[PDB]
């Protein structure tokens with residue numbers, strides 16, 4: 001069975017808007033989301049439909065861009081680092097579960113290259 005998805009709303013979690021978080025939505029997420037290779041990462045891994053019964057035995061901190069998108073739209077984060085960590089968790093999970101040269105790894109690598117290029121221009125905090 002699939003686990004519940006990561007939370008995207010929690011009144012107990014401190015949060016704010018920052019210009020860096022705005023950039024993470026308007027530049028970083030938008031750039032990756034529209035990419036031809038985005039689709040496997042646009043929602044949680046459905047280990048039932050994909051017949052990956054071991055997925056959530058290996059991947060204990062799942063993350064995906066659907067979750068990130070909702071978190072950004074909900075202003076769920078306190079700082080840019082929290083959101084950058086979610087992106088890196090997503091990429092790392094893919095590399096942990098899969099193997100070098102797999103199609104899904106090539107897709108993650110293409111998205112990660114753009115992620116790195118955009119994060120390199122993260123604005124200074126206002």
Ligand SMILES: Cc1sc2c(c1C)C(c1ccc(Cl)cc1)=N[C@@H](CC(=O)NCc1ccc(/C=C/C(=O)NO)cc1)c1nnc(C)n1-2
Pocket residue numbers: 039040041045046050052094097098103104
């Ligand atoms: C909806 C999702 S989420 C997700 C995947 C898919 C289809 C994929 C995946 C996505 C795109 C591509 Cl091109 C190949 C595999 N992988 C699995 C992991 C997975 O099933 N591995 C086995 C697998 C199954 C089918 C193919 C098909 C190739 C093909 O060319 N189809 O004809 C290859 C390996 C995986 N990991 N991390 C993520 C994220 N994924």
